[PDB]
Design a protein around this ligand. Structure first.
Ligand SMILES: [Cl-]
Ligand SMILES: [Cl-]
Lengths: 306, 306
């Protein structure tokens, strides 16, 4: 019993974290096989970040200007290139702790675990979601750039995020491991504003299912609804529209609990219209939207990883 | 910026997790040096749990009845003993991944990270607190027994919890690594009820400090209070009494932000008396009490671990 915001075990990623220093800037890199991935703004000074020309700044950089430290051992850089907003530093030694891994670009509403690091050393692990506005609400201080987000399927790490920037509003933006930003953000100190942070409706429903599985059921009502009618309420509260694809994904949880997806939509409707009247659901006083339907199934069944 | 419920990196503990099977019961054990620690109810059947006599049930067990599997390799058991509510299984091979470690018994209100495991394999990591009633609000399914809670200071893992039981109310109870239960609970399927779950006042204040550090400041008011007057409000809302020791622990956060501890107590008072009027603090609609003052300092400064 019990349902918790739970990250993947981080050991497999911990073994990939290194420190990258260029000039006077130090951040984290990701060492997989004989390549080290890091944000390209490692080459920038604080003054460069206002209007950097990365191609021009890179011309002044040679292999030996990139200092790569794996804990206590120095790695030899034999090649470097820029791919979108990341640098790939080729080193002469394959990481002996490289796990099976893939690079994946996730969609808004998908969740992942972040290993926060400073100077190439792990600091902590927590769970995040890619928001509909393509930000994440993380915990990142100066020097955390290069920290990565990941998912694990049994024995394989799917890397999906690398941290790059913090918006003036306190939220965070980054790239996939090919160096492409999520959303419209750029690696410059510029007037960059996030759009509407809508709520991930399908994740809230999955979390309501998780609550029923664990004894929290006061919110179940006698009503049902339709997609179109529920979506009229969703729009009013800045909830993502619910699609038939979302309903299908919720099918397994609907099957286990015996509560049709649309009946649970009607319970969500009343929670949005009437509030929670000071009550709680799985220890929260608001509706949680950073659990996917796959997250709920995993935690409610005890799935493990190699 | 940003403040998140963050666990310690789990890699060092992942390397200590093994599977222990006795008869038809399988749970997790902790392999440190040449000893494997696991709950003593591994020797019990579901029928034994009603009224077990552990000394009598253990007489029928020999070294070869305890099957210990480290991932894929079988470990040879050369000795076993019972210490309070844990078994110590002596194996013929020291765990080569043993970190520096200590066994610590924590106090109510202290936090720690849990590595949930099934069949000796890590499933996920999340943060917990020892409640004032000596339970924890975890996420544990059948087979998770033997999962451990821990803290890390730089290079040293302090093991503080091993999971044993789930109360009928859905909360959880366990032992330190010497086999002594936290609180009055016992490893029997018995009418066991948790006492009042009071709120850890000092942790709520630390979390209010964390919020101010990150821009959430709407709750700061023009009032102050005294310990005795605040504690009259704390008692009414089932908050732990605040002591001068707690005030001293908050000193560093009071120094950094410039908000005297008692001024922040007056803000907490108004939040308890008037509620939050539908607002949020660090993304929560209730007052979080599972961050210690040391947790806040750590996350707000970027402390790392070897
Ligand atoms: Cl999640
Ligand atoms: Cl914490």
């Amino acid at each position: 019993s019990g349902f918790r915001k739970m990250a993947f075990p981080s050991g497999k990623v911990e073994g990939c974290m290194v420190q990258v220093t260029c000039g006077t800037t130090t951040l984290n890199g990701l060492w997989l096989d004989d390549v080290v991935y890091c944000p390209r703004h490692v080459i920038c000074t604080s003054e460069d970040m206002l209007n950097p020309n990365y191609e021009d700044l890179l011309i002044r950089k040679s292999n030996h200007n990139f200092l790569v430290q794996a804990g206590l051992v120095q790695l030899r850089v034999i090649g470097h290139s820029m791919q979108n907003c990341v640098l790939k530093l080729k080193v002469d030694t394959a990481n002996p702790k490289t796990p099976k891994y893939k690079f994946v670009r996730i969609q808004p509403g998908q969740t992942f675990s972040v290993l926060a690091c400073y100077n190439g050393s792990p600091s902590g692990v927590y769970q995040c979601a890619m928001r509909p506005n393509f930000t994440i609400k993380g915990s990142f201080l100066n020097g955390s750039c290069g920290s990565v987000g990941f998912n694990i399927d049994y024995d394989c790490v799917s890397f999906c995020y690398m941290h790059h920037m913090e918006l003036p509003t306190g939220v965070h933006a980054g790239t996939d491991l090919e160096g492409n930003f999520y959303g419209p953000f750029v690696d410059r100190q510029t007037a960059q504003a996030a759009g509407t942070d809508t709520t991930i409706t399908v994740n809230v429903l999955a979390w309501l299912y998780a609550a029923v599985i664990n004894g929290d059921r006061w919110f179940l009502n006698r009503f049902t609804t339709t997609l179109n009618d529920f979506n009229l309420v969703a729009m009013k509260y800045n909830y993502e529209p619910l699609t038939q694809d979302h309903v299908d994904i919720l099918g397994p949880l609907s099957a286990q609990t015996g509560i049709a997806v649309l009946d649970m939509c009607a319970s969500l409707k009343e929670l949005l219209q009437n509030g929670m009247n000071g009550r709680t659901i799985l220890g929260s006083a608001l509706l949680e939207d950073e659990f996917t339907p796959f997250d709920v199934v995993r935690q409610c069944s005890g799935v493990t990883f190699q």
